[PDB]
Design a protein around this motif. Sequence first.
Motif, PDB file in Angstrom:
ATOM      1  N   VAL A  31       0.816  -1.206   0.000  1.00 26.10           N
ATOM      2  CA  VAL A  31       0.000   0.000   0.000  1.00 26.10           C
ATOM      3  C   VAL A  31       0.844   1.246   0.000  1.00 26.10           C
ATOM      4  N   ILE A  32       0.378   2.262  -0.714  1.00 27.08           N
ATOM      5  CA  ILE A  32       1.052   3.541  -0.677  1.00 27.08           C
ATOM      6  C   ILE A  32       0.018   4.635  -0.384  1.00 27.08           C
ATOM      7  N   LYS A  33       0.356   5.578   0.503  1.00 25.82           N
ATOM      8  CA  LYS A  33      -0.543   6.694   0.868  1.00 25.82           C
ATOM      9  C   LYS A  33      -0.734   7.688  -0.280  1.00 25.82           C
ATOM     10  N   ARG A  34      -1.919   8.299  -0.360  1.00 23.39           N
ATOM     11  CA  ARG A  34      -2.215   9.306  -1.390  1.00 23.39           C
ATOM     12  C   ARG A  34      -1.150  10.386  -1.493  1.00 23.39           C
ATOM     13  N   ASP A  35      -0.712  10.901  -0.347  1.00 19.18           N
ATOM     14  CA  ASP A  35       0.282  11.971  -0.325  1.00 19.18           C
ATOM     15  C   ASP A  35       1.599  11.542  -0.955  1.00 19.18           C
ATOM     16  N   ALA A  36       2.135  10.422  -0.478  1.00 17.55           N
ATOM     17  CA  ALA A  36       3.396   9.924  -1.000  1.00 17.55           C
ATOM     18  C   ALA A  36       3.300   9.580  -2.495  1.00 17.55           C
ATOM     19  N   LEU A  37       2.157   9.048  -2.934  1.00 18.15           N
ATOM     20  CA  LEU A  37       1.984   8.714  -4.350  1.00 18.15           C
ATOM     21  C   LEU A  37       1.964   9.971  -5.220  1.00 18.15           C
ATOM     22  N   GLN A  38       1.121  10.937  -4.863  1.00 19.17           N
ATOM     23  CA  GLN A  38       1.033  12.199  -5.612  1.00 19.17           C
ATOM     24  C   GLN A  38       2.395  12.896  -5.766  1.00 19.17           C
ATOM     25  N   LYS A  39       3.234  12.824  -4.738  1.00 14.91           N
ATOM     26  CA  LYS A  39       4.551  13.450  -4.834  1.00 14.91           C
ATOM     27  C   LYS A  39       5.368  12.860  -5.996  1.00 14.91           C
ATOM     28  N   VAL A  40       5.404  11.532  -6.089  1.00  9.76           N
ATOM     29  CA  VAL A  40       6.124  10.847  -7.169  1.00  9.76           C
ATOM     30  C   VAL A  40       5.528  11.157  -8.553  1.00  9.76           C
ATOM     31  N   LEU A  41       4.198  11.166  -8.624  1.00 10.59           N
ATOM     32  CA  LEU A  41       3.484  11.443  -9.864  1.00 10.59           C
ATOM     33  C   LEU A  41       3.798  12.839 -10.397  1.00 10.59           C
ATOM     34  N   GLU A  42       3.850  13.818  -9.493  1.00  6.52           N
ATOM     35  CA  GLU A  42       4.106  15.212  -9.858  1.00  6.52           C
ATOM     36  C   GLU A  42       5.518  15.424 -10.401  1.00  6.52           C
ATOM     37  N   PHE A  43       6.473  14.608  -9.954  1.00  5.37           N
ATOM     38  CA  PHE A  43       7.828  14.683 -10.494  1.00  5.37           C
ATOM     39  C   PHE A  43       7.926  13.998 -11.858  1.00  5.37           C
ATOM     40  N   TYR A  44       7.580  12.715 -11.891  1.00 13.77           N
ATOM     41  CA  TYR A  44       7.818  11.878 -13.064  1.00 13.77           C
ATOM     42  C   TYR A  44       6.645  11.946 -14.050  1.00 13.77           C
ATOM     43  N   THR A  45       6.311  13.166 -14.461  1.00  9.63           N
ATOM     44  CA  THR A  45       5.080  13.423 -15.226  1.00  9.63           C
ATOM     45  C   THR A  45       4.820  12.490 -16.431  1.00  9.63           C
TER      46      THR A  45
END
Length: 146
Positions: A110-124
């Motif tokens: 499982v990954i938390k929404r916050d931690a996931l969004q951070k990665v997504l925002e970098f690796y567009t």
Amino acid sequence: DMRADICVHLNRKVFKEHPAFRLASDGCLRALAMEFQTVHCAPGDLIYHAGESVDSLCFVVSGSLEVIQDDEVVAILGKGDVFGDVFWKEATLAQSCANVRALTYCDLHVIKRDALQKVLEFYTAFSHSFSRNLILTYNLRKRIVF
């Protein structure tokens, strides 16, 4: 130091199995692996209760789970399934409409929404391929009408 790379390897049944990760670069997978947690359930364990806030994306790598709303079994999840909420397309967190109970011993990653969004925002680049490829098996936010 290979701590991160051990964590990438420990998540291989998600990273190397789920199509949403096909475009993830090694650096991207390292950033994700640091944020993933492996949860071990026993039969009967409740992973999510109805009313609870849906703030994590959950990949089943092992075992079976039942989804239940209103004391009715509405779905059964198994290996390779993913449940939670679309945090990349959804502005705000919401309450769960259903219980998720383990039917057997289960491993969830499982990954938390916050931690996931951070990665997504970098690796567009990965983030758009991820979005187009991650189809929830169950969206805890949507309510089944019987």
